[PDB]
Design an enzyme around this catalytic site. Structure first.
Site, PDB file in Angstrom:
ATOM      1  N   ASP A 180       0.790  -1.229   0.000  1.00  0.00           N
ATOM      2  CA  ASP A 180       0.000   0.000   0.000  1.00  0.00           C
ATOM      3  C   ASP A 180       0.820   1.275   0.000  1.00  0.00           C
ATOM      4  O   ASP A 180       0.181   2.346  -0.005  1.00  0.00           O
ATOM      5  CB  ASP A 180      -1.050  -0.059   1.129  1.00  0.00           C
ATOM      6  CG  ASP A 180      -0.381  -0.149   2.485  1.00  0.00           C
ATOM      7  OD1 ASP A 180       0.808   0.231   2.570  1.00  0.00           O
ATOM      8  OD2 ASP A 180      -0.986  -0.623   3.423  1.00  0.00           O
ATOM      9  N   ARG A 182       0.612   6.644  -0.288  1.00  0.00           N
ATOM     10  CA  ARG A 182      -0.012   5.621   0.551  1.00  0.00           C
ATOM     11  C   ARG A 182      -1.391   5.477  -0.091  1.00  0.00           C
ATOM     12  O   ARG A 182      -2.037   6.490  -0.337  1.00  0.00           O
ATOM     13  CB  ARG A 182      -0.064   6.077   1.997  1.00  0.00           C
ATOM     14  CG  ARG A 182      -0.941   5.223   2.919  1.00  0.00           C
ATOM     15  CD  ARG A 182      -0.390   3.830   2.929  1.00  0.00           C
ATOM     16  NE  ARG A 182      -0.964   3.060   4.015  1.00  0.00           N
ATOM     17  CZ  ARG A 182      -2.155   2.436   3.871  1.00  0.00           C
ATOM     18  NH1 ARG A 182      -2.853   2.478   2.758  1.00  0.00           N
ATOM     19  NH2 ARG A 182      -2.606   1.790   4.966  1.00  0.00           N
ATOM     20  N   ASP A 197      -5.574  -1.118   3.422  1.00  0.00           N
ATOM     21  CA  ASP A 197      -4.503  -1.545   4.298  1.00  0.00           C
ATOM     22  C   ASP A 197      -4.031  -2.928   3.843  1.00  0.00           C
ATOM     23  O   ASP A 197      -4.776  -3.898   4.006  1.00  0.00           O
ATOM     24  CB  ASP A 197      -4.834  -1.546   5.793  1.00  0.00           C
ATOM     25  CG  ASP A 197      -3.522  -1.702   6.568  1.00  0.00           C
ATOM     26  OD1 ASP A 197      -2.432  -1.299   6.132  1.00  0.00           O
ATOM     27  OD2 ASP A 197      -3.604  -2.281   7.665  1.00  0.00           O
ATOM     28  N   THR A 198      -2.830  -2.945   3.292  1.00  0.00           N
ATOM     29  CA  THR A 198      -2.231  -4.246   2.910  1.00  0.00           C
ATOM     30  C   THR A 198      -1.477  -4.632   4.189  1.00  0.00           C
ATOM     31  O   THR A 198      -1.156  -3.707   4.948  1.00  0.00           O
ATOM     32  CB  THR A 198      -1.217  -4.177   1.721  1.00  0.00           C
ATOM     33  OG1 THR A 198      -0.278  -3.132   2.115  1.00  0.00           O
ATOM     34  CG2 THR A 198      -1.892  -3.933   0.368  1.00  0.00           C
ATOM     35  N   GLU A 230       1.272  -5.550   6.776  1.00  0.00           N
ATOM     36  CA  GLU A 230       2.561  -4.988   7.099  1.00  0.00           C
ATOM     37  C   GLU A 230       3.638  -6.031   6.837  1.00  0.00           C
ATOM     38  O   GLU A 230       3.447  -7.212   7.169  1.00  0.00           O
ATOM     39  CB  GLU A 230       2.628  -4.717   8.607  1.00  0.00           C
ATOM     40  CG  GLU A 230       3.907  -3.967   9.031  1.00  0.00           C
ATOM     41  CD  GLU A 230       3.963  -2.656   8.277  1.00  0.00           C
ATOM     42  OE1 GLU A 230       3.036  -1.861   8.308  1.00  0.00           O
ATOM     43  OE2 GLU A 230       5.021  -2.564   7.619  1.00  0.00           O
ATOM     44  N   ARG A 283       3.095  11.288   3.415  1.00  0.00           N
ATOM     45  CA  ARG A 283       2.858  10.440   2.233  1.00  0.00           C
ATOM     46  C   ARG A 283       1.604  10.952   1.490  1.00  0.00           C
ATOM     47  O   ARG A 283       0.598  11.245   2.145  1.00  0.00           O
ATOM     48  CB  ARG A 283       2.621   8.990   2.496  1.00  0.00           C
ATOM     49  CG  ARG A 283       3.572   8.213   3.391  1.00  0.00           C
ATOM     50  CD  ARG A 283       2.620   7.639   4.407  1.00  0.00           C
ATOM     51  NE  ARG A 283       2.682   6.270   4.616  1.00  0.00           N
ATOM     52  CZ  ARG A 283       2.065   5.408   5.385  1.00  0.00           C
ATOM     53  NH1 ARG A 283       0.987   5.666   6.098  1.00  0.00           N
ATOM     54  NH2 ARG A 283       2.668   4.208   5.380  1.00  0.00           N
TER      55      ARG A 283
HETATM   56  C1  LIG Z   1      -4.442   5.428   4.314  1.00  0.00           C
HETATM   57  C2  LIG Z   1      -4.123   6.383   5.425  1.00  0.00           C
HETATM   58  C3  LIG Z   1      -3.178   6.131   6.423  1.00  0.00           C
HETATM   59  N1  LIG Z   1      -2.933   7.099   7.354  1.00  0.00           N
HETATM   60  C4  LIG Z   1      -2.258   6.776   8.639  1.00  0.00           C
HETATM   61  C5  LIG Z   1      -3.140   6.006   9.615  1.00  0.00           C
HETATM   62  C6  LIG Z   1      -2.018   5.290  10.395  1.00  0.00           C
HETATM   63  O1  LIG Z   1      -1.239   6.147  11.276  1.00  0.00           O
HETATM   64  P1  LIG Z   1      -0.287   5.436  12.361  1.00  0.00           P
HETATM   65  O2  LIG Z   1       0.923   4.952  11.650  1.00  0.00           O
HETATM   66  O3  LIG Z   1      -0.051   6.354  13.485  1.00  0.00           O
HETATM   67  O4  LIG Z   1      -1.115   4.129  12.762  1.00  0.00           O
HETATM   68  C7  LIG Z   1      -1.088   4.874   9.263  1.00  0.00           C
HETATM   69  C8  LIG Z   1      -1.442   3.581   8.569  1.00  0.00           C
HETATM   70  O5  LIG Z   1      -0.502   3.470   7.483  1.00  0.00           O
HETATM   71  P2  LIG Z   1       0.251   2.127   7.142  1.00  0.00           P
HETATM   72  O6  LIG Z   1      -0.665   1.011   6.777  1.00  0.00           O
HETATM   73  O7  LIG Z   1       1.258   2.470   6.118  1.00  0.00           O
HETATM   74  O8  LIG Z   1       0.900   1.750   8.539  1.00  0.00           O
HETATM   75  O9  LIG Z   1      -1.165   5.935   8.338  1.00  0.00           O
HETATM   76  C9  LIG Z   1      -3.581   8.304   7.360  1.00  0.00           C
HETATM   77  O10 LIG Z   1      -3.295   9.111   8.225  1.00  0.00           O
HETATM   78  N2  LIG Z   1      -4.508   8.543   6.395  1.00  0.00           N
HETATM   79  C10 LIG Z   1      -4.785   7.607   5.451  1.00  0.00           C
HETATM   80  O11 LIG Z   1      -5.623   7.902   4.623  1.00  0.00           O
HETATM   81 CA   LIG Z   2      -0.371  -1.173   5.463  1.00  0.00          CA
END
Ligand SMILES: Cc1cn([C@H]2C[C@H](OP(=O)(O)O)[C@@H](COP(=O)(O)O)O2)c(=O)[nH]c1=O
Ligand SMILES: [Ca+2]
EC number: 3.1.31.1
Length: 135
Positions: free
Chosen positions: A15, A29, A34-35, A37, A81
């Protein structure tokens, strides 16, 4: 919403990808998905993590055309991102992953939910077919 060209630099995981956007390397992103980790220690290499990355990777590397489609809200998350719907030869990678049971519809933060129903329907379909994540 409208699609804007981008050039693949590198797929990081399922993702998260690095794209050249407006002549600027940027990490994107995938909106609404959510793919699993494969990176973060606090999460570990999750099931389908590798599969999701390969999928995105493949889809993006084999694409003739990559397009980023920002939603109506924030275009970047707190990590800086870009948040978009990414298309590989007009196929939305976000949906592609969901449809395959390689991503779950996650982080639905209004108003960046323009394609939520779309993705939700594909996710239902993937769960329905017990694909990957839903298997
Ligand atoms: C897709 C997406 C992720 N994010 C944030 C939520 C999560 O924050 P936290 O890292 O604090 O949990 C994280 C999830 O991304 P990843 O799946 O890359 O970890 O990125 C956003 O803020 N907005 C979004 O639209
Ligand atoms: Ca992810």
């Amino acid at each position: 919403l409208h699609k804007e060209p981008a050039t693949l630099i590198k797929a990081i995981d399922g993702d998260t990808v690095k794209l050249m956007y407006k002549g600027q390397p940027m990490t994107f992103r995938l909106l609404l998905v959510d793919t699993p980790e494969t990176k973060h220690p606090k999460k570990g290499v999750e099931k389908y993590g590798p599969e999701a990355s390969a999928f995105t990777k493949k889809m993006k590397e084999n694409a003739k055309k990559i397009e980023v489609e920002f939603d109506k809200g924030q275009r970047t998350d707190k990590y800086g991102r870009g948040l978009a719907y990414i298309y590989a030869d007009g196929k939305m990678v976000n949906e592609a992953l969901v449809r395959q049971g390689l991503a779950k519809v996650a982080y639905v933060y209004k108003p960046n939910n323009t394609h939520e129903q779309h993705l939700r329907k594909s996710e239902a379909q993937a769960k329905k077919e017990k694909l990957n994540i839903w298997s």
